[PDB]
Amino acid sequence: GTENLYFQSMQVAFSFILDNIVTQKMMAVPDSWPFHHPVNKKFVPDYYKMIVNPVDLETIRKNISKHKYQSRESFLDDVNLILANSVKYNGPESQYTKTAQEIVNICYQTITEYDEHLTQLEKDICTAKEAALEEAELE
C-alpha cells in the first residue's frame, strides 16, 4: 500500500547514501584490498574460530542492498567490527590494522559531512516505518 512503498523509497534513499560512502570513501582507501572481501574460510579456518562476527566491505554493501541499516548506528557498528576484528586477529600494531583504522576514520569523517540529512532521513524512515506498520496491522 502507500505507506509501505514510501517506507521502502526512504530506505532506498538511505541505502544510496550509505553505499556512496562505502564505494567512494572506504573502498578508495589505499591498500584497503584485504578488507574488500570476506576471508576464505577454507584458506584460514583459524580466522572463523577466532572471529565470531566477520565483516568486510563487500558484505557491508550487500547488507546495504538488503536494507539491514536503518540508522547510522547499526552501519557504524559493522564498520567498527572491521577494525576490532583486525586488532584481534592481526594485532593492534599491524599495518592491516592501520589500514582498518583509516577505513574507519574516513567513514566517520564522511558520515559527519552528511550528518544533518542522515538525521532527517533516519527520522523519515522511523516515521514511515510506523505509518507502514499501522497500514499493515489495519488491513
PDB file of C-alpha atoms in Angstrom:
ATOM      1  CA  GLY A   1       0.000   0.000   0.000  1.00  0.00           C
ATOM      2  CA  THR A   2       1.032   3.649   0.006  1.00  0.00           C
ATOM      3  CA  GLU A   3       2.781   3.719   3.418  1.00  0.00           C
ATOM      4  CA  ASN A   4       4.911   0.671   2.770  1.00  0.00           C
ATOM      5  CA  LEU A   5       6.146   1.797  -0.636  1.00  0.00           C
ATOM      6  CA  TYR A   6       7.010   5.196   0.723  1.00  0.00           C
ATOM      7  CA  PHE A   7       8.802   3.478   3.630  1.00  0.00           C
ATOM      8  CA  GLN A   8      10.766   1.485   1.057  1.00  0.00           C
ATOM      9  CA  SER A   9      11.610   4.531  -1.002  1.00  0.00           C
ATOM     10  CA  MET A  10      13.148   6.202   2.090  1.00  0.00           C
ATOM     11  CA  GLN A  11      15.172   3.057   2.802  1.00  0.00           C
ATOM     12  CA  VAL A  12      16.296   3.188  -0.824  1.00  0.00           C
ATOM     13  CA  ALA A  13      17.477   6.775  -0.401  1.00  0.00           C
ATOM     14  CA  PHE A  14      19.323   5.904   2.863  1.00  0.00           C
ATOM     15  CA  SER A  15      20.921   2.944   1.220  1.00  0.00           C
ATOM     16  CA  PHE A  16      22.016   5.062  -1.696  1.00  0.00           C
ATOM     17  CA  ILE A  17      23.882   7.406   0.676  1.00  0.00           C
ATOM     18  CA  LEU A  18      25.497   4.630   2.718  1.00  0.00           C
ATOM     19  CA  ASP A  19      26.616   2.847  -0.431  1.00  0.00           C
ATOM     20  CA  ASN A  20      28.220   6.062  -1.696  1.00  0.00           C
ATOM     21  CA  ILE A  21      30.301   6.302   1.478  1.00  0.00           C
ATOM     22  CA  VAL A  22      31.409   2.661   1.140  1.00  0.00           C
ATOM     23  CA  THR A  23      32.344   2.883  -2.576  1.00  0.00           C
ATOM     24  CA  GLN A  24      33.687   6.422  -2.788  1.00  0.00           C
ATOM     25  CA  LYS A  25      35.487   6.712   0.563  1.00  0.00           C
ATOM     26  CA  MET A  26      36.143   3.419   2.297  1.00  0.00           C
ATOM     27  CA  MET A  27      36.989   1.267  -0.729  1.00  0.00           C
ATOM     28  CA  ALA A  28      39.138   4.058  -2.047  1.00  0.00           C
ATOM     29  CA  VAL A  29      41.498   3.841   0.976  1.00  0.00           C
ATOM     30  CA  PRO A  30      44.977   2.850  -0.312  1.00  0.00           C
ATOM     31  CA  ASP A  31      45.884  -0.773   0.413  1.00  0.00           C
ATOM     32  CA  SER A  32      42.338  -1.463   1.623  1.00  0.00           C
ATOM     33  CA  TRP A  33      42.036  -4.595  -0.556  1.00  0.00           C
ATOM     34  CA  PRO A  34      42.357  -7.140   2.306  1.00  0.00           C
ATOM     35  CA  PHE A  35      39.140  -5.669   3.684  1.00  0.00           C
ATOM     36  CA  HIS A  36      37.170  -5.720   0.396  1.00  0.00           C
ATOM     37  CA  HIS A  37      36.047  -9.337   0.515  1.00  0.00           C
ATOM     38  CA  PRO A  38      35.242 -11.946   3.163  1.00  0.00           C
ATOM     39  CA  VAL A  39      38.078 -14.152   4.441  1.00  0.00           C
ATOM     40  CA  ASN A  40      38.095 -17.519   2.694  1.00  0.00           C
ATOM     41  CA  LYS A  41      37.231 -19.970   5.486  1.00  0.00           C
ATOM     42  CA  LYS A  42      38.863 -22.945   3.775  1.00  0.00           C
ATOM     43  CA  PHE A  43      42.081 -20.924   3.385  1.00  0.00           C
ATOM     44  CA  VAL A  44      42.157 -19.654   7.043  1.00  0.00           C
ATOM     45  CA  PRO A  45      39.865 -21.824   9.190  1.00  0.00           C
ATOM     46  CA  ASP A  46      41.509 -20.321  12.339  1.00  0.00           C
ATOM     47  CA  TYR A  47      40.004 -16.938  11.317  1.00  0.00           C
ATOM     48  CA  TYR A  48      36.457 -18.100  11.693  1.00  0.00           C
ATOM     49  CA  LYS A  49      37.134 -19.819  15.034  1.00  0.00           C
ATOM     50  CA  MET A  50      38.714 -16.588  16.433  1.00  0.00           C
ATOM     51  CA  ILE A  51      36.344 -14.052  14.862  1.00  0.00           C
ATOM     52  CA  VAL A  52      32.643 -14.564  15.723  1.00  0.00           C
ATOM     53  CA  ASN A  53      31.318 -11.682  13.535  1.00  0.00           C
ATOM     54  CA  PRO A  54      33.386 -11.286  10.365  1.00  0.00           C
ATOM     55  CA  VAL A  55      32.680  -8.197   8.305  1.00  0.00           C
ATOM     56  CA  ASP A  56      34.251  -6.818   5.102  1.00  0.00           C
ATOM     57  CA  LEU A  57      33.284  -4.059   2.659  1.00  0.00           C
ATOM     58  CA  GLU A  58      31.533  -6.314   0.168  1.00  0.00           C
ATOM     59  CA  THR A  59      29.426  -7.778   2.933  1.00  0.00           C
ATOM     60  CA  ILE A  60      28.531  -4.288   4.211  1.00  0.00           C
ATOM     61  CA  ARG A  61      27.398  -3.321   0.652  1.00  0.00           C
ATOM     62  CA  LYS A  62      25.267  -6.481   0.463  1.00  0.00           C
ATOM     63  CA  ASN A  63      23.774  -5.583   3.831  1.00  0.00           C
ATOM     64  CA  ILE A  64      23.077  -2.069   2.497  1.00  0.00           C
ATOM     65  CA  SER A  65      21.326  -3.578  -0.560  1.00  0.00           C
ATOM     66  CA  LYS A  66      19.213  -5.790   1.828  1.00  0.00           C
ATOM     67  CA  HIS A  67      18.386  -2.660   3.833  1.00  0.00           C
ATOM     68  CA  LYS A  68      19.970  -4.013   7.003  1.00  0.00           C
ATOM     69  CA  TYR A  69      20.833  -0.498   8.195  1.00  0.00           C
ATOM     70  CA  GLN A  70      18.036   1.938   9.099  1.00  0.00           C
ATOM     71  CA  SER A  71      20.344   4.224  11.055  1.00  0.00           C
ATOM     72  CA  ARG A  72      23.970   5.230  11.141  1.00  0.00           C
ATOM     73  CA  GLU A  73      24.459   3.345  14.450  1.00  0.00           C
ATOM     74  CA  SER A  74      23.972  -0.161  13.036  1.00  0.00           C
ATOM     75  CA  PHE A  75      26.061   0.793   9.962  1.00  0.00           C
ATOM     76  CA  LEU A  76      28.865   2.274  12.072  1.00  0.00           C
ATOM     77  CA  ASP A  77      28.852  -0.784  14.338  1.00  0.00           C
ATOM     78  CA  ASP A  78      29.576  -3.076  11.357  1.00  0.00           C
ATOM     79  CA  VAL A  79      32.247  -0.660  10.074  1.00  0.00           C
ATOM     80  CA  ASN A  80      33.910  -0.687  13.558  1.00  0.00           C
ATOM     81  CA  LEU A  81      33.980  -4.509  13.535  1.00  0.00           C
ATOM     82  CA  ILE A  82      36.406  -4.224  10.578  1.00  0.00           C
ATOM     83  CA  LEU A  83      38.882  -2.557  12.996  1.00  0.00           C
ATOM     84  CA  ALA A  84      38.025  -4.633  16.026  1.00  0.00           C
ATOM     85  CA  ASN A  85      38.413  -7.937  14.141  1.00  0.00           C
ATOM     86  CA  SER A  86      41.792  -6.824  12.692  1.00  0.00           C
ATOM     87  CA  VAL A  87      43.081  -5.636  16.081  1.00  0.00           C
ATOM     88  CA  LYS A  88      42.239  -9.117  17.432  1.00  0.00           C
ATOM     89  CA  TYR A  89      43.456 -11.267  14.519  1.00  0.00           C
ATOM     90  CA  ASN A  90      46.318  -9.308  13.016  1.00  0.00           C
ATOM     91  CA  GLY A  91      47.348  -7.283  16.075  1.00  0.00           C
ATOM     92  CA  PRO A  92      46.896  -3.628  17.238  1.00  0.00           C
ATOM     93  CA  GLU A  93      50.108  -2.500  15.525  1.00  0.00           C
ATOM     94  CA  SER A  94      49.670  -4.449  12.277  1.00  0.00           C
ATOM     95  CA  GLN A  95      49.811  -2.455   9.029  1.00  0.00           C
ATOM     96  CA  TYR A  96      46.456  -4.133   8.253  1.00  0.00           C
ATOM     97  CA  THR A  97      45.098  -2.646  11.480  1.00  0.00           C
ATOM     98  CA  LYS A  98      46.446   0.751  10.469  1.00  0.00           C
ATOM     99  CA  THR A  99      44.534   0.388   7.178  1.00  0.00           C
ATOM    100  CA  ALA A 100      41.317  -0.609   9.016  1.00  0.00           C
ATOM    101  CA  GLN A 101      41.781   2.384  11.256  1.00  0.00           C
ATOM    102  CA  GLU A 102      41.976   4.530   8.131  1.00  0.00           C
ATOM    103  CA  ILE A 103      38.815   2.921   6.725  1.00  0.00           C
ATOM    104  CA  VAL A 104      37.012   3.680   9.978  1.00  0.00           C
ATOM    105  CA  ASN A 105      38.301   7.262  10.140  1.00  0.00           C
ATOM    106  CA  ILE A 106      37.232   8.104   6.616  1.00  0.00           C
ATOM    107  CA  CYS A 107      33.787   6.576   7.265  1.00  0.00           C
ATOM    108  CA  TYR A 108      33.297   8.837  10.319  1.00  0.00           C
ATOM    109  CA  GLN A 109      34.574  11.949   8.517  1.00  0.00           C
ATOM    110  CA  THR A 110      32.077  11.251   5.746  1.00  0.00           C
ATOM    111  CA  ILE A 111      29.126  10.485   7.999  1.00  0.00           C
ATOM    112  CA  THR A 112      29.917  13.771   9.777  1.00  0.00           C
ATOM    113  CA  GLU A 113      29.645  15.756   6.484  1.00  0.00           C
ATOM    114  CA  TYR A 114      26.243  14.107   5.863  1.00  0.00           C
ATOM    115  CA  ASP A 115      25.006  14.385   9.484  1.00  0.00           C
ATOM    116  CA  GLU A 116      22.041  16.732   9.204  1.00  0.00           C
ATOM    117  CA  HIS A 117      20.498  14.844   6.237  1.00  0.00           C
ATOM    118  CA  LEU A 118      21.198  11.401   7.570  1.00  0.00           C
ATOM    119  CA  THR A 119      19.341  12.544  10.765  1.00  0.00           C
ATOM    120  CA  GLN A 120      16.451  13.878   8.587  1.00  0.00           C
ATOM    121  CA  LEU A 121      16.280  10.544   6.635  1.00  0.00           C
ATOM    122  CA  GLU A 122      16.571   8.367   9.731  1.00  0.00           C
ATOM    123  CA  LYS A 123      13.632  10.327  11.192  1.00  0.00           C
ATOM    124  CA  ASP A 124      11.692   9.954   7.886  1.00  0.00           C
ATOM    125  CA  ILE A 125      12.386   6.197   7.965  1.00  0.00           C
ATOM    126  CA  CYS A 126      11.324   5.849  11.665  1.00  0.00           C
ATOM    127  CA  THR A 127       8.129   7.778  10.775  1.00  0.00           C
ATOM    128  CA  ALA A 128       7.373   5.828   7.589  1.00  0.00           C
ATOM    129  CA  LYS A 129       8.122   2.558   9.477  1.00  0.00           C
ATOM    130  CA  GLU A 130       5.423   3.490  11.977  1.00  0.00           C
ATOM    131  CA  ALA A 131       2.938   4.505   9.239  1.00  0.00           C
ATOM    132  CA  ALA A 132       3.638   1.255   7.287  1.00  0.00           C
ATOM    133  CA  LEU A 133       3.146  -0.829  10.448  1.00  0.00           C
ATOM    134  CA  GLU A 134      -0.232   0.861  11.113  1.00  0.00           C
ATOM    135  CA  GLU A 135      -1.332   0.255   7.488  1.00  0.00           C
ATOM    136  CA  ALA A 136      -0.215  -3.398   7.649  1.00  0.00           C
ATOM    137  CA  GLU A 137      -1.853  -4.172  11.008  1.00  0.00           C
ATOM    138  CA  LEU A 138      -5.067  -2.373   9.966  1.00  0.00           C
ATOM    139  CA  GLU A 139      -5.732  -4.429   6.763  1.00  0.00           C
TER     140      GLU A 139
END
